[PDB]
């Protein structure tokens, strides 16, 4: 029986995994060894502490992360969702629209 | 196994009040300019902690065997590095494993396996006054280790690394928490500028290392490093001087705390939530500086 | 100064003091 | 309050959809997803009212 | 009028993991020539290595192989902290009782 548990001890190496490249300033999909999310990973300006990996904010959501290999701090940001609106003079005069 | 130092005279324990001490980072998560409430084991504010001390003026061979219920906040102040590594266990008769720690200059050796102790555990080094050099002489704290399971060696510990007598400038804080078969140790090494007792200041404790064993520890004791000199002739068991030593011992209880983070991500202020009606009001309001009103 | 704000309006605006984007929220 | 209501088990294995989806197969993760759906829907309804 | 919502889809699928070339020793767990008693059940901690997960599933046949809380096919990408290994020999009739 292989015995393991989650959220019982902080980890930095964990179990098996492979490594790929790193990209920034693009809304990409990432998985930093158990930390899964989607966003834009710009270079961070915050000052961390040597034992202090993650980062959060008031609402307790991820806002920064440390590189497992190069040990540098880079931000996380959702990639610009929003809504659209259609402006029309009416079908009755014309048919052009303007999308906002 | 080992010698049995005399003068085992009883003495009532002393007491002193802990002034906002024993706060550690509960997890490796960065937070900035936020107030976070945690539900974890902590040292309650404004409790009286014991004041074991060893002084030649009897000889005050004071290192009794002390309980380990849930955690122990250990705070030892000195300057001659008289203190040494700690020691743990449940029965201390080699039937069950017992954790050992030594913080000498070489390395932080950690022994977890079984080994039988002697009835009066003690560490002593016979310094040679003929040679202008200091070396370890005697190592007698256990009989032998028949079988062993786990071992661990880390980087050499951070000490003052200087042997002299002077003003009290060194303060050592340690938290010994073990839960779910996981042994954790925290520390801080802040200096002091006042002679005696806990200074009226606040400082947080950062994590050091995690030791996964799975052993049950219920029993606690402290090792002491003692130097024997020629200034006290006679039997080798009594021909020694211990200088001045002091260490405080507290206890940990399940209490809810409120933590204040600065913009370096360091805890600068904490508020207990079960001490005072005003403290409970602060905890409920999730802020400081409560104004008028019921 | 800002063209149409009188001194009392300026005092009122400075006296009143109060928002990162989240999942689904918009203003 | 509405934002902080997101991180709640609501009597499920976990409060994050990704963990449930990756760690569990659909046929028995459906109940956990339904529980989270009900909880978040109720919270949003109360906020709107 | 408002019609729909606008979202930016992810582009890449980057993933990172510190490069540790150590292979986790499954040999003394799943291929040990000697086994211990049930009362003295073995427990070895596994860390600081990459677990060769694939070979254990695609090259070995197990009469009983069931997973609780984690999908067996998703075990490839999920890593854990302080993986434990238990080795013991028990009666075949009592194997079913080893479950939460
Ligand atoms: C606009 O459309 C309506 C039908 O929806 C039509 O009855 C009306 O006559 C149109 N406008 C004008 C100015 O005729
Ligand atoms: C005193 O200590 C010695 C060695 O430390 C031990 O052999 C002896 O049994 C002890 N005497 C007691 C426990 O009465
Ligand atoms: C101080 O310590 C002694 C013994 O523990 C006793 O007077 C009392 O319990 C303590 N006082 C406070 C305020 O905790
Ligand atoms: C010492 O530990 C080993 C390892 O399990 C065990 O086989 C042996 O019986 C133990 N010896 C004693 C005296 O308990
Ligand atoms: C630890 O706790 C268990 C369960 O309460 C108890 O049986 C055991 O005697 C304790 N001590 C050791 C060394 O296991
Ligand atoms: C936070 O850290 C920076 C980096 O040195 C420092 O300049 C700043 O003073 C720190 N914040 C405070 C409140 O001291
Ligand atoms: C990756 O490999 C390098 C080889 O130069 C070595 O430092 C170590 O094994 C790994 N380093 C890190 C930071 O993971």
Burial label, B40 (beta-carbon count in 10 A; 0-12, 13-18, 19+): middle
- In the block, tokens 């000490």 appear at B159
Tokens of C9: 């309006």
| Tokens coding A90 | 């009416």
Q: List the residue whose alpha carbon is closest to atom 9 of ligand 4.
A: B147
Distance of CA D33 to the CA centre of its chain: 6
CA distance B30 to B243: 43
Its domain, for residue B228, covers 15-294
Tokens of D43: 């919270």
Chain B residue with Cα closest to E82: B212
Residue among A36, A59, A60 whose CB faces D18 most closely: A36
Q: Would you say residue B3 lies in a domain?
A: no
For this PDB entry, the determination method is cryo-EM
Distance CA B240, CA B56 (A): 9
Chains in contact with E, where contact requires at least 3 CB pairs less than 8 Å apart? A, B, D
Answer whether A59 sits within 8 Å of C22, measured CB to CB: yes
A–E CB contacts, 8 A cutoff, strictly below: 128
Confirm whether B2 is domain-assigned. no
Is ligand 3 within 6 A of the CB of residue B48? yes
Residues E83/E49, Cβ–Cβ less than 8 Å: no
Tokens linked to A27: 């809304």
Instruction: Let me know if residue B8 belongs to a domain.
Output: no
Which CATH number belongs to the domain containing residue B215 in this structure? Answer: 2.60.120.960
- Say how many Å lie between the CA of residue B17 and the centre of ligand 3: 8
Q: How far apart are CA B245 and CA B82, in angstroms?
A: 7
Residue B63 covered by a domain? yes
Q: Is residue B10 part of a domain?
A: no
> What domain count does chain B have?
1
Is B109 inside a domain boundary?
yes
Distance A70 CA to ligand 7 centre (A): 10
- Of E58, D24, E78, nearest to A2 by C-alpha is E78
Residue B238's Cβ-count burial label (10 Å; 0-12, 13-18, 19+) is middle
Let me know if residue B122 belongs to a domain. Answer: yes
In a domain, B1, yes or no: no
Cα–Cα distances in angstroms (integers) from residue A62 to residues A35, A51, A54, D2, D24, in the given order: 10, 17, 8, 18, 24
What is the total residue count of chain B? Answer: 294
Q: Test B30 with A64 for CB contact under 8 angstroms.
A: yes
Q: Could you give the 3-state DSSP secondary structure of residue D9?
A: coil
């Amino acid at each position: 029986v292989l015995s393991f548990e989650l959220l019982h001890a902080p980890a930095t190496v964990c179990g098996p995994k492979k490594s790929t490249n790193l990209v920034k300033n693009k809304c990409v999909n990432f998985n930093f060894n158990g930390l899964t999310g989607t966003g834009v990973l710009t270079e961070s300006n915050k000052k961390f502490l040597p034992f202090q990996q993650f980062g959060r904010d008031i609402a307790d959501t991820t806002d920064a992360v440390r590189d497992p290999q190069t040990l540098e701090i880079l931000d996380i940001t959702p990639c610009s969702f929003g809504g659209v609106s259609v402006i029309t003079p009416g079908t009755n005069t014309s048919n052009q629209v303007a999308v906002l | 196994q080992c010698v049995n130092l005399t003068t085992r005279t009883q003495l009532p324990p002393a007491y002193t009040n802990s002034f906002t001490r024993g706060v550690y980072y509960p997890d490796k998560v960065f937070r900035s300019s936020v107030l976070h409430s945690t539900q974890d084991l902590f040292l309650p504010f404004f409790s009286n902690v014991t004041w074991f001390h060893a002084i030649h003026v009897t000889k005050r061979f004071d290192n009794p065997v002390l309980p380990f219920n849930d955690g122990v906040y250990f705070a030892s102040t000195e300057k001659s590095n008289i203190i040494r590594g700690w020691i743990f266990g449940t029965t201390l008769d080699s039937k069950t494993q017992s954790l050992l720690i030594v913080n000498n200059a070489t390395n932080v050796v950690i022994k977890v396996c079984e080994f039988q102790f002697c009835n009066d555990p003690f560490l002593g080094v016979y310094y040679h006054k003929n040679n202008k050099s200091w070396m370890e002489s005697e190592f007698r704290v256990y009989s032998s280790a028949n079988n062993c399971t786990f071992e661990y060696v880390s980087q050499p510990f951070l000490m003052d690394l200087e042997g002299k007598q002077g003003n009290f400038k060194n303060l050592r804080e340690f938290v010994f928490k073990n839960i779910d078969g996981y042994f954790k140790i925290y520390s801080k090494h802040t200096p002091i500028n006042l002679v005696r007792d806990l200074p009226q200041g606040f400082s947080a404790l950062e994590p050091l290392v995690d030791l996964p064993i799975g052993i049950n520890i219920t029993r606690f004791q402290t090792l002491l490093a003692l130097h024997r000199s020629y200034l006290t002739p006679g039997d080798s068991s009594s021909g020694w001087t211990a200088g001045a030593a002091a260490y405080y011992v507290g206890y940990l209880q399940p209490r809810t705390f409120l933590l204040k983070y600065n913009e370096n991500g360091t805890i600068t202020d904490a508020v207990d939530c079960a001490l005072d009606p005003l403290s409970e009001t602060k905890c409920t309001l999730k802020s400081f500086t409560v104004e008028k009103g019921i | 100064k800002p063209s149409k704000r009188s001194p009392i309006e300026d005092l009122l605006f400075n006296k009143v003091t109060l928002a990162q984007k989240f999942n689904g929220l918009t203003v | 309050t509405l934002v902080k209501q997101l991180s709640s088990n609501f009597g499920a294995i976990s409060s994050v959809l990704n963990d449930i989806l990756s760690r569990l197969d659909p046929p028995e993760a459906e109940v956990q997803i339904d529980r989270l759906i009900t909880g978040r829907l109720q919270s949003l309804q109360t906020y709107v009212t | 009028y408002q019609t729909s919502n606008f979202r930016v889809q992810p582009t890449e699928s980057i993933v990172r993991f510190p490069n540790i070339t150590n292979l986790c020793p499954f040999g003394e767990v799943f291929n040990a020539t000697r086994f211990a008693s049930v009362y003295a059940w073995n427990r070895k901690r596994i860390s600081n290595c990459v677990a060769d997960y694939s070979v254990l599933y695609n090259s070995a046949s197990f009469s009983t192989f069931k997973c609780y809380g984690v999908s067996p096919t998703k075990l490839n990408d999920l890593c854990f902290t302080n993986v434990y290994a238990d080795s013991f020999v028990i009666r075949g009739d009592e194997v079913r009782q080893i479950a939460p």
